[PDB]
């Protein structure tokens, strides 16, 4: 066999059922194939976990969480990708999902990274907040741990309905296992600081995502952890002392002074909290790059609500950071 990836061969039939069409995707997780399920007469995406002990063990958690989420039949569970079944094949765990359309990063690429409208952004935000509310159900208490444009797919290319995919790093509250999680751009302060985390890290990622969906570019595009914390401090200032006092990796980015206060451990950036979200969104200057100037649904009053909700989702404190239910009650969502 030689190596971790399954030899994929377009046109072969798996177990007189799955007709392999093409390789959808590759990556560290393994691979994804488009396949025709002859039994159910429908296209499916099969996620082939790498044949490595570490990846197989993590994929048992993925399968457990997915099955748990699909079992909870309610008014929230259809913002989550549906795992139809799974099987072992050629020493690979294989997860069969419904076929969906493209991810929100592709939607950004098809606007030449100009960003989508505030109106489309709000539709994505209401779906995602609803999804996070569902994850926050006691019985689930699921932390996604990897929200980013790539992991939010459109159901249909013509419509704005979405689902969340890739619960490959997901854990339940109280079952934290990796000190290093989240895609860097969407990584919460508590994680960069190497502290314990809860469902609040998803709400952080969602704040970063919504800004990027409208501006067409990442809010915080760090080359590494130091650069990432610095780009956050640029907008949000130095994080509160009560947090940095309890933070194992505080001294990676910050310095205590005789004072008792924290400062950036400078070795260069805009001063702390001087990169205003106000200016990044271009509230009073016609939106991102001036492209929404005079457009309907891009008034200053619209922007101020959006910005307010973003700033509640980018709260440094995970205890006071806005939680799904309260986010859905925000004026930004009101008719
Ligand atoms: C294309 C498509 C439809 C459904 C899925 C599922 C995926 C998942 O759960 N993790 C992934 C990670 C990378 C790419 C795709 C997926 O992928």
CA dihedral sign of residues 205, 212, 61, 84: positive
Same domain, residue pair 135 and 228 = yes
C-alpha span between 104 and 73 (Å, rounded) = 26
**CATH at residue 83:** 3.30.200.20
- Ligand 1 centroid from CA 43, angstroms: 14
Same domain, residue pair 72 and 114 = no
Three-state DSSP string of 128-174: HHHHHHHHCCCCCCEECCCCCHHHEEECCCCCCCEEECCCCCCEECC
The residue from 146, 166, 202, 302 that is catalytic is: 146
C-alpha span between 316 and 145 (Å, rounded) = 17
Q: Do 288 and 216 touch, CB atoms closer than 8 A?
A: yes
- Ligand 1 centroid from CA 167, angstroms: 9
Write out the two tokens for 178.
Answer: 């990796």
What phi and psi, each to the nearest 5 degrees, are found at residue 190? -60, -30
Same domain, residue pair 142 and 39 = no
Domain assignment present for residue 119? The answer is yes
Identify the CA nearest to 238 among candidates 260, 216, 219.
260
Same domain, residue pair 62 and 194 = no
Question: Cβ(166) to ligand 1 under 6 A?
Answer: yes
Question: Cβ(154) to ligand 1 under 6 A?
Answer: no
Nearest residue by C-alpha to atom 17 in ligand 1: 45
**CATH at residue 237:** 1.10.510.10
- Ligand 1 centroid from CA 59, angstroms: 13
Tell me the Cα Rg of the chain.
21
Q: Do 304 and 231 touch, CB atoms closer than 8 A?
A: no
C-alpha span between 164 and 78 (Å, rounded) = 9
Task: Please tell me the experimental approach by which this structure was elucidated.
Answer: X-ray
Domain assignment present for residue 8? The answer is no
- Ligand 1 centroid from CA 32, angstroms: 7
C-alpha span between 130 and 148 (Å, rounded) = 16
Q: Name the residue of 30, 33, 45 whose CB sits within 8 Å of the most ligand 1 atoms, as the mutation to test its pocket.
A: 45
Structure's resolution in angstroms: 2.2
C-alpha span between 320 and 60 (Å, rounded) = 33
Query: What CA dihedral angle connects 102, 109, 188 and 129, to 10 degrees?
Result: -50
Three-state DSSP string of the chain: CCCCCCCCCCCCEECCCEEEEEEEECCCCEEEEEEEECCCCEEEEEEEECCCHHHHHHHHHHHHHHHHHHHCCCCCHHHECCEEEEEEECCEEEEEEECCCCEHHHHHHCCCCCCCCHHHHHHHHHHHHHHHHHHCCCCCCEECCCCCHHHEEECCCCCCCEEECCCCCCEECCCCCCCCCCCHHHCCHHHHCCCCCCCHHHHHHHHHHHHHHHHCCCCCCCCCHHHHHHHHHHHHCCCCHHHHHCCCCHHHCEEECCCCCEEECCCCCCCCCCCCHHHHCCCCCCCHHHCCCCCCCCCHHHHHHHHHHHHHHCCCCCCCCCCHHHHHCCHHHCC
Name 154's bridge partners: 162
Same domain, residue pair 157 and 184 = yes
Write out the two tokens for 312.
Answer: 């509640």
Domain assignment present for residue 3? The answer is no
- Ligand 1 centroid from CA 263, angstroms: 41
Same domain, residue pair 18 and 145 = no
Identify the CA nearest to 102 among candidates 150, 146, 46.
150
Residue with tokens 């019985």: 139
C-alpha span between 254 and 261 (Å, rounded) = 10
Q: Name the residue of 24, 26, 30, 32 whose CB sits within 8 Å of the most ligand 1 atoms, as the mutation to test its pocket.
A: 32
Q: Do 94 and 30 touch, CB atoms closer than 8 A?
A: no
Domain assignment present for residue 6? The answer is no
Question: Cβ(321) to ligand 1 under 6 A?
Answer: no
Write b or e for each residue in 113-149: b if 16 or more Cβ atoms lie within 10 A of its Cβ, otherwise e: eebbbbebbbebbebbbbbbbbbbeeebebbbbbbbb
Residue at a domain's end among 99, 131, 165: 99
Same domain, residue pair 66 and 109 = no
Write b or e for each residue in 61-90: b if 16 or more Cβ atoms lie within 10 A of its Cβ, otherwise e: bbbebbeebeeeeeebbbbbbebeebeeee
Cα 205 to the center of its chain, rounded Å: 5
- Give the β-pairing of 92-98 and 42-49: antiparallel
- Ligand 1 centroid from CA 31, angstroms: 9
Same domain, residue pair 132 and 250 = yes
User: Number of folded domains in the chain?
Assistant: 2
Name 49's bridge partners: 30
Atom number of ligand 1 nearest to Cα 66: 9
Q: Name the residue of 166, 167, 169, 170 whose CB sits within 8 Å of the most ligand 1 atoms, as the mutation to test its pocket.
A: 166
Question: Cβ(48) to ligand 1 under 6 A?
Answer: no
Domain assignment present for residue 83? The answer is yes
Residue with tokens 């691979």: 31
Question: Cβ(81) to ligand 1 under 6 A?
Answer: yes
Residue at a domain's end among 50, 74, 99: 99
Same domain, residue pair 134 and 247 = yes
Domain assignment present for residue 1? The answer is no
Which domain, by its residues, includes 70? Answer: 13-99
Domain assignment present for residue 5? The answer is no
Residue at a domain's end among 99, 117, 138: 99
Atom number of ligand 1 nearest to Cα 166: 10
Same domain, residue pair 136 and 81 = no
CA dihedral sign of residues 43, 101, 218, 142: negative
Same domain, residue pair 91 and 120 = no
Q: Is 146 a catalytic residue?
A: yes
- Give the β-pairing of 92-98 and 30-37: unpaired
Max CA-CA distance within the chain?
72
Same domain, residue pair 173 and 253 = yes
Nearest residue by C-alpha to atom 16 in ligand 1: 166
Question: Cβ(97) to ligand 1 under 6 A?
Answer: yes
Domain assignment present for residue 261? The answer is yes
């Amino acid at each position: 066999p030689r190596g971790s990836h399954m030899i994929v061969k377009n046109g072969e039939k798996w177990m007189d059922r799955y007709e392999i069409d093409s390789l959808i995707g590759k990556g560290s997780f393994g691979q994804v194939v488009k396949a025709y399920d002859r039994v159910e007469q429908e296209w499916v995406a099969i996620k082939i976990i790498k044949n490595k002990k570490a990846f197989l063990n993590q994929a048992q958690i993925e399968v457990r969480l997915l099955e748990l989420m699909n079992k909870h039949d309610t008014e929230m569970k259809y913002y989550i990708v549906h795992l139809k079944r799974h099987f072992m094949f050629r020493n690979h765990l294989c997860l069969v999902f419904e076929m969906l359309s493209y991810n929100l990063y592709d939607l950004l690429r098809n606007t030449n990274f100009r960003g989508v409208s505030l109106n489309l952004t709000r539709k994505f935000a209401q779906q995602m907040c609803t999804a996070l509310l569902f994850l926050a159900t006691p019985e689930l208490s699921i932390i996604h741990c990897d929200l980013k444009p790539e992991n939010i797919l459109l159901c249909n290319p013509k419509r704005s309905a979405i689902k969340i995919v890739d619960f490959g790093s997901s854990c339940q509250l109280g079952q934290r296992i990796y000190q290093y999680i989240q895609s860097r751009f969407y990584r919460s302060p508590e994680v960069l600081l190497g502290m314990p985390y809860d469902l609040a890290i998803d709400m952080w990622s969602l704040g970063c995502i919504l800004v990027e969906m409208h501006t067409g570019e990442p809010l915080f595009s760090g080359a590494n952890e130091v650069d990432q914390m610095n780009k956050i401090v640029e907008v949000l200032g130095i994080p509160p002392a009560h947090i940095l006092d309890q933070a194992p990796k505080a001294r990676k980015f910050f310095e205590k002074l005789p004072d008792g206060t924290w400062n950036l451990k400078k070795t260069e950036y805009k001063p702390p909290g001087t990169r205003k979200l106000h200016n990044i969104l271009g509230v009073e200057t016609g939106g991102p790059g001036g492209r929404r100037a005079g457009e309907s649904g891009h008034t200053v009053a619209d922007y101020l609500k959006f910005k307010d909700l973003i700033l509640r989702m980018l709260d440094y404190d995970p205890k006071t950071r806005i939680q799904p239910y309260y986010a859905l009650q925000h004026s930004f969502f009101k008719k």
